[PDB]
């Protein structure tokens, strides 16, 4: 149908905007602490601590499969990255500190993304 196509163009455009959002958030992690999944070879107990691991590469795979239906789902995954880190790592670690900085800087980007998603529909 023509409606299914319209719908699909909206999703494509959301994917376009979420791709730009993802790029902006990922620039706030210049150390690349959150770039890839925590290695289960190197942290073999990780899944005993963290039940839903997340990282920017895994978000990118979902994004490119047009797997985010709305901004809320994308924010859910971004918040997992931060929240997983702040639980596994102690306050006095470079990892924890990196997550706080990513959260704080990401807020600005996500605030305007929400306005853009609502505005452009």
Swiss-Prot record:
There is a cross-link at residue 41 (Glycyl lysine isopeptide (Lys-Gly) (interchain with G-Cter in SUMO2)). Highly expressed in testis. Residues 9-113 form the Bromo domain. Disulfide bonds: none annotated. It is found in: Nucleus; Chromosome. Scaffold subunit of various histone acetyltransferase (HAT) complexes, such as the MOZ/MORF and HBO1 complexes, that acts as a regulator of hematopoiesis. Plays a key role in HBO1 complex by directing KAT7/HBO1 specificity towards histone H3 'Lys-14' acetylation (H3K14ac), thereby promoting erythroid differentiation. Component of some HBO1 complex composed of KAT7/HBO1, MEAF6, ING4 and BRD1/BRPF2. Component of the MOZ/MORF complex composed at least of ING5, KAT6A, KAT6B, MEAF6 and one of BRPF1, BRD1/BRPF2 and BRPF3. Interacts (via PHD-type zinc finger domain) with unmodified histone H3. Interacts (via PWWP domain) with dimethylated and trimethylated 'Lys-79' on histone H3. This is Bromodomain-containing protein 1. The gene is BRD1. The chain holds residues 555 to 674 of 1058 of the full protein.
């Amino acid at each position: 149908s023509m409606e299914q196509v319209a719908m699909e163009l909206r999703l494509t455009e959301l994917t376009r905007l979420l791709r730009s959002v993802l790029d902006q958030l990922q620039d706030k992690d210049p150390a690349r602490i959150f770039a890839q999944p925590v290695s289960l070879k190197e942290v073999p107990d990780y899944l005993d601590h963290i039940k839903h691991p997340m990282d920017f590469a895994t978000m990118r795979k979902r994004l490119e499969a047009q797997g985010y239906k709305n901004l809320h789902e994308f924010e859910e995954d971004f918040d997992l990255i931060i929240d997983n880190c702040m639980k596994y790592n102690a306050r006095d670690t470079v990892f924890y500190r990196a997550a706080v900085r990513l959260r704080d800087q990401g807020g600005v980007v996500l605030r305007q993304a929400r306005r853009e998603v609502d505005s452009i529909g």
